[PDB]
Design a protein around this ligand. Structure first.
Ligand code: CHL
Ligand code: CHL
Ligand SMILES: CCCCCCCCCCCCCCCCCC(=O)OC[C@H](CO[C@@H]1O[C@H](CO[C@H]2O[C@H](CO)[C@H](O)[C@H](O)[C@H]2O)[C@H](O)[C@H](O)[C@H]1O)OC(=O)CCCCCCCCCCCCCCCCC
Ligand code: CLA
Ligand code: CLA
Ligand code: CLA
Ligand code: CLA
Ligand SMILES: CCCCCCCCCCCCCCCCCC(=O)OC[C@H](CO[C@@H]1O[C@H](CO)[C@H](O)[C@H](O)[C@H]1O)OC(=O)CCCCCCCCCCCCCCCCC
Ligand SMILES: CC(/C=C/C=C(C)/C=C/[C@@]12O[C@]1(C)C[C@@H](O)CC2(C)C)=C\C=C\C=C(C)\C=C\C=C(C)\C=C\[C@@]12O[C@]1(C)C[C@@H](O)CC2(C)C
Ligand SMILES: CC(/C=C/C=C(C)/C=C/[C@@]12O[C@]1(C)C[C@@H](O)CC2(C)C)=C\C=C\C=C(C)\C=C\C=C(C)\C=C\[C@@]12O[C@]1(C)C[C@@H](O)CC2(C)C
Ligand SMILES: CCCCCCCCCCCCO[C@@H]1O[C@H](CO)[C@@H](O[C@H]2O[C@H](CO)[C@@H](O)[C@H](O)[C@H]2O)[C@H](O)[C@H]1O
Lengths: 42, 208, 198, 154
């Protein structure tokens, strides 16, 4: 169990989980706010 | 706190894990994937099972009792599945944000007790009240144990806590039961009970 | 036991408790360096004091206007009004005066007790106090600068800073002033919330 | 307007691009049935195209002779949303990333094997440090004045 959690903290797995969460967030941001060449809220 | 080597196990004939010795209530040696091997994860998941059990027992009653009496000529409660789509005295998002604030307070003090036992057992305004319980997950005090069945000798407390976790495991299966039933079937779970009692050999999962 | 901002969390070591308003609150560790702690204490005092005066000058003239006793412009519309001087002249006056006062206070922050005397009149100096609490003419009523008193000053400053943070963000999304928001909420709180405003 | 450009709300080429794009999607739409799923997909793309062009023309974007939004990064206050404002947002995020990673490297530099916590992340330590970047311009500025940001004599 502790060894399994230590494996999940290795560089590639932490990178995938972190970049997957990051990719999903940016996808939803461009899904609710598509296009946008500017910062429109001024 | 009282280990039991010859306790009735989940899999009769097998060997219990070294980290499940029978001191916990509802201990049947069931952990094939070793999710609670280390003591830190064991105590955290023990609190997780306890809170899961209590919420699911409230949910099991909130489904199976109103859905039962409304089928009878007694009540008018709508379906538990569609109870969210209903409109109450204010919009759902306001009820949820209020619930988040108030339940967040209760869970915040509950989290402080889990990470640091005993450091939250006093009222931060009127210090004389306090909570009497000494075990994590069993706060005691006047609010959460007024009748006093919770401060007793061991064995007896172990019997009652075994009853609690067992009913909660049954309720967790019961709540998920009603969920996947109302997805598979298109009616209330009391209709599933009556449909099965009407034809137990045919009115099963193999009916669609 | 000095007061716990989080009953479970322990207090940081560098926050001894000798400071008024100490509740062990510094999750990001911005005041770990004692010099950062010394500078941020003055920053909290001045920000809290300006927020207290600001919240008062924003709320109290408006409630007295909505009641009917006076007719004073709202805090966001008080700038567009016409005054006896050009707004640019008002800016330069405020800049020059604060460019003198704030730097005199800053000399005390770096070097304590170095600006206690009047450079124009050699006499009429300030007695020795603490940084952020200048004695003498700045305390005419001769109150007692002590605990609780200093703790209430910091507590009111913290609530007023949160109050200013509420006023600006409310006025942005609600369009009106603070007292109008409270009246709109008081009429029907279950249907006049930030949930309904958005 | 600026640099000889005309605002996209005034440009004819900008509106002709919106027309030709929508008409091209409509030409793909006639091939499918009105209740079809490709039809609802193409209709949603058309509505998304109208929304995009309208938003660009509404926020004061300048257009060239090509009918395409040109950005002005000289600092003109009419177009701070085109660079300076998103750039400040980036610098806030970039400083956050660098400051948190720096806090992590400082915290593990005194470990027995500092390389161990670099190839196997200490997630508890990371989760406690990720929110220090929220106040990174302050913590960094103070470390600049106190001589803590730069190593002496390197
Ligand atoms: C344990 C708490 C809890 C549970 C089990 C449910 C369950 C449900 N809610 Mg609520 N809700 C819960 C809390 C709350 N709901 C709402 C507000 C609403 C609204 C407004 C609506 C629902 C709806 C639904 C249903 C959505 C069906 C689905 O596929 O969902 C997604 C599936 C999952 C999340 C998986 C969960 C089960 C998994 C463990 C197996 C469903 C039966 C909707 C409904 O009635 O649909 C018919 C709906 O419109 N809920 C609030 C705010 C007061 C809650 C606060 O705690
Ligand atoms: C120190 C804080 C401070 C703050 C928070 C504000 C905030 C504001 N001033 Mg202001 N001012 C401040 C100081 C000062 N102002 C002025 C002189 C003016 C003028 C002349 C005007 C404002 C206006 C405004 C408003 C601009 C519209 C807006 O933001 O809409 C969201 C706004 C609420 C404008 C206004 O009234 O807009 C309605 C306006 O015309 N201010 C002076 C004197 C030099 C100040 C000195 O400290
Ligand atoms: C809404 C309008 C008004 C707003 C007013 C502002 C409100 C802001 C509230 C913030 C806190 C709310 C939630 C707190 C939940 C408890 C989390 C916690 O245990 O918070 C405290 C923790 C730990 O606190 C300090 O954390 C420090 C960081 O070092 C540590 O960092 C890690 C901590 O996990 C590791 O333990 C590691 O070994 C160690 O180096 C030191 O441990 C200090 O001793 C310790 O006191 O920090 C942390 O997670 C910090 C997490 C909170 C960051 C908030 C950022 C907000 C943007
Ligand atoms: C340094 C190079 C660079 C730069 C500056 C940009 C910049 C941009 N790209 Mg782009 N892109 C690039 C490289 C680059 N790209 C490359 C190499 C590819 C090929 C893989 C792409 C493929 C690509 C696609 C397919 C799209 C873009 C889009 C965009 C725009 C969307 C902005 C946005 O996401 O909304 C705003 C997002 C945010 C504000 C997120 C920040 C908020 C954080 C997460 C939280 C804030 C907390 C406070 C933006 C101006 C999109 C577009 O429509 O263009 C207009 C789009 O669809 N890009
Ligand atoms: C200065 C900022 C600050 C912040 C951000 C918090 C934040 C918090 N406090 Mg706290 N508190 C503060 C100052 C602060 N406090 C001070 C100065 C005191 C002394 C007067 C206290 C005394 C205090 C007590 C006694 C308790 C808290 C508790 C809590 C937690 C309750 C969460 C909740 O209400 O549900 C969710 C909130 C939503 C908005 C959703 C929360 C994270 C409670 C707790 O959780 O205990 C662990 C608790 O019992 N606070
Ligand atoms: C059948 C399930 C069950 C059982 C056996 C227990 C047993 C126990 N609970 Mg628990 N509890 C449950 C469900 C259960 N609980 C649920 C669903 C919740 C969420 C609401 C809680 C929330 C809860 C808290 C917060 C606390 C306890 C505590 C206790 C202990 C105190 C002794 C006692 O009064 O026992 C129960 C005696 C019974 C006869 C069982 C109750 C049957 C009810 C009355 C039926 C009601 C029907 C329903 C309203 C419809 C005890 C071992 C306290 C403790 O640990 O003391 C230190 C404590 O603080 N319980
Ligand atoms: C640092 C806090 C602060 C600030 C920046 C302001 C700023 C301002 N106040 Mg205000 N005020 C404050 C605190 C503050 N006030 C407090 C605590 C009170 C008592 C509750 C008042 C009561 C008050 C009234 C009754 C009026 C103002 C007015 C004004 C505006 C005209 C300036 C002026 O009065 O002429 C110069 C000031 C001299 C002393 C000379 C101006 C924007 C006036 C206004 O609305 O403009 C028409 C107005 O009538 N203020
Ligand atoms: C060794 C190599 C060295 C190289 C050095 C290279 C240097 C190159 C230049 C660097 C500095 C360039 C500054 C250019 C400023 C242009 C803006 C300007 O002057 O116009 C003046 C601008 C004009 O601003 C514009 O005005 C227009 C209407 O005329 C519109 O309103 C536009 O929207 C608005 O952007 O006004 C300002 O915003 C300037 C305010 C400055 C206030 C400073 C106060 C604090 C002072 C200290
Ligand atoms: C079943 C369940 C979890 C089961 C998990 C199991 C068996 C895992 C087994 C193992 O891991 C172990 C143990 C050991 C490992 O080595 C091996 C495996 C095999 C992996 C949870 C249910 C949990 C179910 C819960 C907690 C339900 C709570 C219900 C609530 C709160 C109420 C909801 C409602 O209120 C609404 C929303 C609307 C109202 O109308 C109606 C009501 C019903 C009132
Ligand atoms: C100064 C101030 C307001 C001053 C307002 C003024 C003068 C208003 C003036 C006028 O209105 C009048 C009167 C009349 C109007 O006609 C004209 C104007 C001009 C409008 C607000 C400060 C406001 C200051 C605020 C809100 C500060 C908040 C800081 C917080 C919450 C920090 C918390 C933490 O940093 C710790 C402590 C520990 C870390 O580890 C974690 C975190 C969480 C980061
Ligand atoms: C040790 C196992 C013993 C089980 C033995 C069961 C043997 C049953 C007799 C052989 C099969 C007869 O065939 C079956 O008979 C059963 C009686 O059970 C009846 O079955 C009926 O069950 C319920 C009972 O109300 C009805 O609602 C349903 O509509 C119908 O399926 C049917 O008439 C026929 O489908």
């Amino acid at each position: 169990m502790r060894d399994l959690k230590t494996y999940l903290s290795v560089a590639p797995v932490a990178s995938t989980l972190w970049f997957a969460a990051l990719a999903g967030l940016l996808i939803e941001i461009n899904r609710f706010f598509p296009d946008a060449l500017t910062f429109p809220f001024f | 706190t009282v280990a039991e080597p010859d306790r009735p196990l989940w899999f009769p004939g097998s060997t219990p894990p070294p980290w499940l010795d029978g001191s916990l209530p509802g201990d049947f040696g069931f952990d094939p994937l070793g999710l609670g091997s280390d003591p830190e994860s064991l105590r955290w998941n023990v609190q997780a099972e306890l809170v899961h059990s209590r919420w699911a027992m409230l949910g099991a009653a909130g489904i199976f009792i109103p859905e039962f009496l409304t089928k009878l000529g007694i009540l008018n409660t709508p379906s538990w599945y569609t109870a969210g789509e209903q409109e109450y005295f204010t919009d759902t998002t306001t009820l949820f944000i209020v619930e988040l604030v108030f339940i967040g307070w209760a869970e915040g003090r509950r989290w402080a007790d889990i990470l640091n036992p005993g450091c939250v057992n006093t009222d931060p305004i009127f210090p004389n009240n306090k909570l009497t319980g000494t075990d994590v997950g069993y706060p005691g005090g006047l609010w959460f144990d007024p009748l006093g069945w919770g401060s007793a000798s061991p064995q007896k407390l172990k019997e009652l806590r075994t009853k609690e976790i067992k009913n909660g495991r049954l309720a967790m299966l019961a709540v998920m039961g009603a969920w996947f039933q109302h997805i598979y079937t298109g009616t209330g779970p009391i209709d599933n009970l009556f449909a099965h009692l009407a034809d137990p050999g045919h009115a099963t999962i193999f009916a669609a | 036991k000095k007061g716990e901002w989080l009953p479970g969390l322990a207090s940081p070591g560098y926050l001894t408790g000798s400071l008024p308003g100490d509740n062990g609150f510094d999750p990001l560790g911005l005041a770990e360096d004692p010099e950062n702690l010394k500078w941020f204490v003055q920053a909290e005092l001045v920000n809290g004091r300006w927020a207290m005066l600001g919240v008062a000058g924003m709320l109290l003239p408006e409630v007295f206007t909505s009641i009917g006793i006076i007719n004073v412009p709202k805090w966001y519309d008080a700038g567009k009004e016409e005054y006896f001087a050009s707004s640019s002249t008002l800016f330069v006056i405020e800049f020059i005066l604060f460019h003198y006062v704030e730097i005199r206070r800053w000399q005390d922050i770096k070097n304590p007790g170095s600006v206690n005397q009047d450079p124009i009149f050699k006499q009429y100096s300030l007695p020795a106090g603490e940084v952020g609490y200048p004695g003498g003419i700045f305390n005419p009523l001769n109150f007692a600068p002590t605990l609780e008193a200093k703790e209430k000053e910091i507590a009111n400053g913290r609530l007023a800073m949160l109050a200013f943070l509420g006023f600006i963000i409310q006025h942005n999304v609600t369009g009106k002033g603070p007292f109008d928001n409270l009246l709109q909420h008081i009429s029907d709180p279950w249907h006049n919330t930030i949930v309904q405003t958005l | 307007d600026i640099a000889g450009l005309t605002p996209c709300k005034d440009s004819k080429q900008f509106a002709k691009r919106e027309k030709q794009s929508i008409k091209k999607l409509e030409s793909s739409l006639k091939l499918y049935a009105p209740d079809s799923a490709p039809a609802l997909a193409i209709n949603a793309t058309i509505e998304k195209t109208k929304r995009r062009f309208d938003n660009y023309g509404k926020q004061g974007l300048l257009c060239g002779a090509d009918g395409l939004p040109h950005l002005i990064v000289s600092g003109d206050q009419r177009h701070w949303g085109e660079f300076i404002t998103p750039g400040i947002l980036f610098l806030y995020i970039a400083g956050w990333i660098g400051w948190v990673g720096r806090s992590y490297l400082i915290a593990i530099r005194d470990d027995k094997k500092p390389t161990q916590k670099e190839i196997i992340i200490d997630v508890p330590l990371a989760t406690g440090l990720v929110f220090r970047g929220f106040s990174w311009p302050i913590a960094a500025y103070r470390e600049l004045l106190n001589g803590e940001l730069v190593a002496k004599d390197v």
